[PDB]
Amino acid sequence: ESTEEVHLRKMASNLRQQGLKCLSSVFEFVGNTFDWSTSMEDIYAVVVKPRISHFSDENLQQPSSLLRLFLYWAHNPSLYQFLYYDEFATATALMDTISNQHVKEAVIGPIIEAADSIIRNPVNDDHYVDLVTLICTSCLKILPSLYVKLSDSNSISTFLNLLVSITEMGFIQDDHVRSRLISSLISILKGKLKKLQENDTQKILKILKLIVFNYNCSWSDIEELYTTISSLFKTFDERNLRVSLTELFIELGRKVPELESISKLVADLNSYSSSRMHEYDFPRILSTFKGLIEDGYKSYSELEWLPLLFTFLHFINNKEELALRTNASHAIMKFIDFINEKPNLNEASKSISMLKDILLPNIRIGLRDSLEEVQSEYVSVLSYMVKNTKYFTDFEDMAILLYNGDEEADFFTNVNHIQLHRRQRAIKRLGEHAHQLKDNSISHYLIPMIEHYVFSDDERYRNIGNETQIAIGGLAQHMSWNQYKALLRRYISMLKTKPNQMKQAVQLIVQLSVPLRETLRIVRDGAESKLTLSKFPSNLDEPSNFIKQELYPTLSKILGTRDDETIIERMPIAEALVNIVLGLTNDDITNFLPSILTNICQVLRSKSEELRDAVRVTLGKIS
């Protein structure tokens, strides 16, 4: 402890670091060639014994030479005696360093890898058995605190491999450790495809199935794990992952008696055909659907709905079989019929909440989907549920749009009709029906349909998109002002994304800004009649100070977009900017009108004659 010579202290520290890294590098470079057994006790007595007491605190921040030597000892089977000295003292120090609050996971990873290697490689010794048991207990204790702390995908895969090795060993028989491992597996399943690899996810599912087979499960925990497995089976498109989820459901059904019937139904639905690899059995699925249509939907419990609801959602989203999609739509209709046939309002509301959590966003995703068959199936399922259920407000709005079920009066029926003229009649009728449809209903349902009609590539379908854009501009007043702002943001994003969509976005922006201009003018005038925009803000200052201060950067971006093709689109954007200026306050309009006038003048200042004529027509409309 003589601190008189800092030069001596620094020389000693440098000698220590160089000597330790030299000994480590000797160990990996020489390898399993030198007879280490002769100098084993001397090496452990000299370099390991004093630093063993504080190795756990020392190597927490970053990998060290002593830690690397320990990891190489754990990796090499012949070097197991180094760990085995002093009753797994070095292994206990490494486990304590893993269990403590490590600065990085870059030190936690290799220790777990060495523990997995030591577990995988058996050694015939009593000290080997004791060290394996101690390492397994330490890993089981550290695992819930290590799975969250591990921020690397490779580290997570190594931890999963170590957990699989521990499950193969069967070190833990307590149900508390099983519950902790189930919570960790649920946390791991709550992730992303980029976060967890498909092979890693399959291995984790296999480990979870092995744990479920090893440990008995209570009914409530089995139901929670079954709901998680149902969500996983809905998410997983891979048939191998589906088979793994089916095996997990079979284990849950072995655990619980009613879950046995539920998993039998799920396995009948998701039974893989032997003839086609990674393909479900069509006849078994058809038989299960036929049973569920008539006898099943009364028989199936409320909790048992969710796995079959997830399977039906997956089958409907799948475009492989239109017959399977129709069967899934029939199953959804049967679920809605069971909800309606339930006499209790709370019993119906439970299925309504389940649909709002799952089936309603699934229908929204199907409507947003480019798949025409899937969108038509979702629309037909929505119409059937609207006919079945009286409770739900968008269902009432859909019935009002149906208007006693006539083909021409109903927007959905004429859309299902192949006639584009019938589609135009449906769009025109929906324009008038926007005065009766709900705002949230319109925003959830008609806006994806109008967007699809606008984005359709046919010329008659482009006429459909123009009529739907007019109807959407009319219904934007019928929609909430927040929904209108969200639609304007979506239109701005579409304009930034695609130039071809931007012209349609410019037309929709003008046809939505004109009702916005009318509503803002009515708010400024303080008219006794209600404004066009439904559920508009009471303060006219706030809505204007939001909309104009958002649209002025948009107008600046449109003006800065000085392209010849964009200039045609900027002309409707100029009309929308004029509408925004008109909706703004008159003094603010008088201030901002020089900017729009200068933009229009720069547009008309083009030397091209045809562009000048087009800008002249646009400026005449604007004036």
Partner RNA sequence: AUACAGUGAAACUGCGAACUCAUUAAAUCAGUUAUCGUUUAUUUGAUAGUCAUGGUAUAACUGUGGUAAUUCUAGAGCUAAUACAUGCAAAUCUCGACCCUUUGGAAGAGAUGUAUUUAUUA
Give residues in contact with RNA (CB under 7 A). 6-7, 10-11, 13-14, 16-17, 20-21, 54, 57-66, 100-101, 103-104
CB of 16 to RNA, least distance (A): 6
Q: How far apart are CA 516 and CA 531, in angstroms?
A: 10
Give the single-character DSSP code of 275.
S
Nearer to RNA, 5 or 372 (CB): 5
Reduced to 3 states, what is the DSSP secondary structure of residue 344? Answer: coil
CB of 1 to RNA, least distance (A): 10
**Taking a C-beta distance cutoff of 8 angstroms, is the pair 270, 190 a contact?**
no
Closer by beta carbon to RNA, 98 or else 355: 98
CB-wise, 93 or 309, nearer to RNA? 93
Of 456, 448, 492, 495, nearest in space to 472 by CA: 448
Distance CA 72, CA 377 (A): 60
Strand partners, 272: 280
CB 71, min distance to RNA, A? 12
Is the Cβ–Cβ distance between 455 and 501 less than 8 Å?
Answer: yes
We find the least distance from the C-beta atom of residue 76 to RNA, in angstroms, to be 19
DSSP, collapsed to helix, strand or coil, labels residue 251 as helix
Minimum CB distance to RNA, residue 60 (Å):
5
Tokens of 270: 């998701």
**Shortest Å, Cβ 101 to RNA:** 5
Name which of 226, 132, 232 is nearest 189 in CA terms.
Answer: 232
Tell me how far apart the alpha carbons of residues 519 and 329 are, in angstroms, rounded to a whole number. Answer: 41
Cβ contact 315:300 at 8 Å: no
Nearer to RNA, 102 or 548 (CB): 102
User: Alpha helix (H) ranges present in 49-99?
Assistant: 55-58, 65-75, 80-84, 89-99
Shortest Cβ 23–RNA spacing (Å) = 10
Question: What's the closest the beta carbon of residue 99 comes to RNA, in angstroms?
Answer: 12
The answer to whether the CB of 570 falls within 8 A of the CB of 506 is: yes
> What is the distance between the alpha carbons of residues 97 and 59, in angstroms, rounded to a whole number?
7
Close Cβ partners of 252 (under 8 Å, ≥ 6 residues apart): 212, 217, 222, 225, 226, 229, 259, 263
Judged by beta carbon, residue 23 or residue 604, the one nearer RNA is 23
Distances from the Cα of 536 to the Cα of 10, 408, 522, 530, angstroms: 74, 33, 11, 9
Least Cα distance to 580 among 542, 614, 536, 550 occurs for 550
- Residue given tokens 């004659």 in the structure block: 609
Closest separation in Å from C-beta 17 to RNA: 4
Structure tokens at 623: 């004036």
Whether the Cβ atoms of residue 543 and residue 537 lie closer than 8 Å to each other: yes
- Give the burial string for 520-539 (b: 16+ CB within 10 Å, else e): bbbbbeeeeeebbbbebeee
In eight-state DSSP terms, residue 415 is H
3-state helix, strand, coil in the chain (%, to 5): 75, 0, 25
Please, which residue, 60 or 316, has the CB nearer to RNA? 60
CB of 499 to RNA, least distance (A): 27
Nearer to RNA, 59 or 468 (CB): 59
Is the CB of 10 or the CB of 278 nearer to RNA? 10
Q: Which is nearer to RNA, 63 or 291 (CB)?
A: 63
With H, G, I as helix, E, B as strand and everything else as coil, classify residue 419.
Answer: coil
CB of 152 to RNA, least distance (A): 17
Q: How far is the CB of 73 from RNA (least distance, A)?
A: 15
Residue 13 or residue 218: which is nearer to RNA going by CB?
Answer: 13
Q: Is the Cβ of residue 59 or residue 311 nearer to RNA in the bound state? A: 59
By beta-carbon proximity to RNA, the closer residue of 51 and 462 is 51
